Design a protein around this nucleic acid. Sequence first.
RNA 1: GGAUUAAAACUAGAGUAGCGAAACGGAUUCGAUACCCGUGUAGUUCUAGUAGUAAACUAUGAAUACAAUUAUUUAUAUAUAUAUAUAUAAAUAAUAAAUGAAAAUGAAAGUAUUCCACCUGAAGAGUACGUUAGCAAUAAUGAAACUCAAAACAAUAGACGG
Lengths: 300, 128, 237, 31, 131, 101, 88
Amino acid sequence: TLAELLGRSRIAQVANNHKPLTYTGKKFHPTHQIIETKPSTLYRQEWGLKSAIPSKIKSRYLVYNDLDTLERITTFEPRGGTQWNRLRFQEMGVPIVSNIGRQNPFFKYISRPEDESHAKLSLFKEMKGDTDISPAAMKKRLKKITALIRSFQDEFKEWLVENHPDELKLNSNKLEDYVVKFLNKKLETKTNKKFNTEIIGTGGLSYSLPGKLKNSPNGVIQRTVVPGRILNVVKENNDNKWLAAIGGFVADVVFFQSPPSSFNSMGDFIRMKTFLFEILEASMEKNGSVSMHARLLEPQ
Amino acid sequence: MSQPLLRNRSPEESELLKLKRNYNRSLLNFQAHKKKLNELLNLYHVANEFIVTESQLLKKIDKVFNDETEEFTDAYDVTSGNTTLQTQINNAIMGSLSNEKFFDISLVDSYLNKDLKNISNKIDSKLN
Amino acid sequence: MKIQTNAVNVLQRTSAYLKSGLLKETPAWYNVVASIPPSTKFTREPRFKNPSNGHIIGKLVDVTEQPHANNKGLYKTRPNSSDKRVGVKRLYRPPKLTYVEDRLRSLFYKQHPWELSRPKILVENEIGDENYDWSHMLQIGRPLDGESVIQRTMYLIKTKQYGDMVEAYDHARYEFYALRMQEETEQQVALEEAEMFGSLFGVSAIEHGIQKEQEVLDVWEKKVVEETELMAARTSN
Amino acid sequence: DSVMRKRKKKMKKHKLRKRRKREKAERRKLS
Amino acid sequence: MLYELIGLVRITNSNAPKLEAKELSSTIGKLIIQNRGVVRDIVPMGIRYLPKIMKKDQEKHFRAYHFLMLFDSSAAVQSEILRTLKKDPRVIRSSIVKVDLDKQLDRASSLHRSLGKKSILELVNEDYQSI
Amino acid sequence: TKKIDQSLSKKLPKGTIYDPFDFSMGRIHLDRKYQANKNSNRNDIMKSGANPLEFYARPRILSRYVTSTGRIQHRDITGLSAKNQRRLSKAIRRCQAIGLM
Amino acid sequence: SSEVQAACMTVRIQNMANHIKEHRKDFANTRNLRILVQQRQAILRYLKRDNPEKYYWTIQKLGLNDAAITDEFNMDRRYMQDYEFFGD
RNA sequence: GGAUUAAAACUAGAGUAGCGAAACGGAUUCGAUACCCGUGUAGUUCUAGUAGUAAACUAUGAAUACAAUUAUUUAUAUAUAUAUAUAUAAAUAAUAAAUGAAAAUGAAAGUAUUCCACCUGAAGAGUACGUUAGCAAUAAUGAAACUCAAAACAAUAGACGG
Ligand SMILES: [K+]
Ligand SMILES: [K+]
Ligand SMILES: [Mg+2]
Ligand SMILES: [Mg+2]
Ligand SMILES: [Mg+2]
Ligand SMILES: [Mg+2]
Ligand SMILES: [Mg+2]
Ligand SMILES: [Mg+2]
Ligand SMILES: [Mg+2]
Ligand SMILES: [Mg+2]
Ligand SMILES: [Mg+2]
Ligand SMILES: [Mg+2]
Ligand SMILES: [Mg+2]
Ligand SMILES: [Mg+2]
Ligand SMILES: [Mg+2]
Ligand SMILES: [Mg+2]
């Protein structure tokens, strides 16, 4: 049918997005899907959208929100520049590593309840992870849940007197433990936030596995040298490290001992010059940012 | 066109309808009655902080207007829900067999229904 | 705008010109239009089903069909106010098409934000030629991307290998990671192998960015200087 | 009615008020 | 009816700043409990500088001891308390606002409700279950 | 001169991604144009769900929605809903009558 | 049932009449009282048509008479003076 | 039929800062019984009444059934991968159709139904007389003769505008 075809159409494949096309806050990762048109189609203003893109657009990459609007225009920005940030990261050949030494999210590991010993930490995270929830929809998590949990009273009024009667007659320090486990055991079958929207690992920035060496005609490369730019002429206030602009990413540059004298000389125009840096490590934070650490390799 | 426009309710259908409607009215009255008793229980738990005698008044005044006591001066955004939400969760699961100082009507219902006693003996008999 | 009458009746108005004799010669279109009548009803048509999800439109659940109690514990014995409002408008409003895959697509790109940075071509080639066997993720003719995961997830739930959508989705995600890792290595190694055989490249991606940033930083230098001199004069006032 | 036409009624009302004030005055002296 | 009294007592003696406030709270509390009323809470608010220089009984003031008193009484008793407060030279400003009890019997003071604690049970249960 | 006004230079945060356009003057102007106090909601008690009328005895919170002279700010500036603006104004007027604001 | 509605209206009429006796210039609530009294007349007039026996029983228990129900009533100024609504 | 009913006004008893008919002065002016300025009485305020009039206007009586859209708020409800999304009403704005002399109306000034009030060329006239009500000012009710072929509305193009 036509409905089946539409669901699989290339336009349906693009997930709905209404995030501001002009965002002036902090950008940590791509927010819009880049659309590309071939040179032949660009010559005919064809992008596979509803309407022809104006001929003024010469780029072959754009990002859009709405196919059509009440203003009879498409809401789009003729830019595709987050792809070059990803490809420049690939050229730096620095694998992303976990600063906490967690399991690789891209491998199906056999995990155990080592961290599940915090059942009361995360079972209540469902009601306590409400930082940005409505004052009454979050309050609907109190009566709606209470009825659901109150429907298991009979089950827990028998299991507890059949598996741990001593605690019911001595102390509730262990009873509270049996309660947290009970609900989780009766909730694992349930589906509360069964889909987790948190970023998985690198989020797709890099699929490179650590360990491989870079062979070169001049021998194996031991230190990666990448051109960059120093943004500030004074270390980040309250931090012992300056900031550099390397390959579309802002890194923290650590200097060997002293800061090169071109800093004082150039002043606030220091960004006008290119320096060579060494990328020590790259980490991924939960916000979805990349923590790139560099070192200002100076001619010596 | 030949079909009758309306079919009157059979006497049996009217009986079942009346049963459901009486049940609906009775259930709502019962649920409101129990809600009121649960609020009366939660008010009893706090009536120890309320003053009805001069002796209580003199003790409250001293305890609040004392140099050691802290006063709400609202000069800074003091830092630190869960506590009151944990008492609710425990009183919903445990019910009569709860350890919370501020319990719900479940405990009072089990008492008058020979449940907290018919379980205490049951547990003790099991221990035997 | 009013439903026009004169555009669809050209044949009948022309026929009056010919019968009276005002028009001597029959127009060339006259016979063609007579054999192929225009559609002239211009009516609004009811619809009784959403083609996307098969939901039935125009069906009222009677109280006889709700014998059991509701979530509140009460029986339904009489129609409610909503049941007593005519719903003819729903028959005529274009149905909102919905798809389960849309929910998964949003999830995938929320979990993998950088997958958005991989350019997607919306221009179709020929939808009718797509002969895909979704037993495997890779397919000849289409790129490996988020859609590969979604279609794989649907095939798993359609074949009933997995029951929960989450489990099928997780299974597809790992297949996607494996294919993404094999490609990241083929590209790295291909570059390394070429340089070892004497391949030369003019400008690298990192170099391209530096040059573009220099062009912008040069114009910015001029303006800063100019605007740091107008301020000095204006402030001197 | 327009302001222009209202003005005719305004004049008639003014003359009636003026005549009734005049009559009142007479009654006071004649009384 | 539940009422919330906010009184600004005068600080005559800098050595005993919380003296007239204690004497006043006892006077008001005794009126409430002696006329079938209940005093639910007494929340001192401390010495605060008045937004301006205020006057009362041919006297001027630049500071006052703020205190809140949540009490339950009848409308007639509430008016009697307000009349006594409007006449006492110690009191500089006094306001009594009704606290609706239509939906729940146990309401905390506005100060506490502003901080998320809607009932006195929530305040007490956070001083026993967690203190 | 080795110095530039802060208004003529953009400081790229740490951990963020950038484009060559981020070093241009257009970025400076674009950031000024689209500079709105959108982070207020998370720091705005009255945009969180609390009832503004419960703050009638807390002048410090209420003083955040009045000008230097005590004039209540128009809803166009506070950004509150009609109900919260209505309740907030009542709270401030009641606070003024009690002798706290 | 009309008898129950009339009784429930009677309670509110009695309370509202007491309010008016202490707030004789509260015309907004006097209008409400008039309309409520007239509403009680309408419900009882229907009862007389539907179930005459219940009607006479109801009005006797409520303290009214047939004339009070059938006759047109406007709770006007003459009524306030002929029945000394406000006293003196 | 009843009740309520701005401002001004009136009957009593208080009040009277500011404002302010009138009055008396100062200016302006050919003159200035005005506009501007001064002094400023009634009034404006409160209590108890009288009176029932306004461009008391949306110049649009009330009720019911029904008819094509969009946008924007509000409310209720639903859902979740939790903050949006989906529903159903209300309000407002711009409209289709329809209606209309057109201006425009737009859920009515549309399609229909039910009930009430009101109109029948201008002027004379909301006047005269009578009656009713009011302390009073007045309010309600409400003509005819004579005379005329006028009178009025929307819109069009001009001319003019301190
Ligand atoms: K005066
Ligand atoms: K009418
Ligand atoms: Mg007319
Ligand atoms: Mg009626
Ligand atoms: Mg007015
Ligand atoms: Mg007088
Ligand atoms: Mg003069
Ligand atoms: Mg003169
Ligand atoms: Mg004057
Ligand atoms: Mg009157
Ligand atoms: Mg008149
Ligand atoms: Mg009139
Ligand atoms: Mg008006
Ligand atoms: Mg009506
Ligand atoms: Mg008259
Ligand atoms: Mg005209």
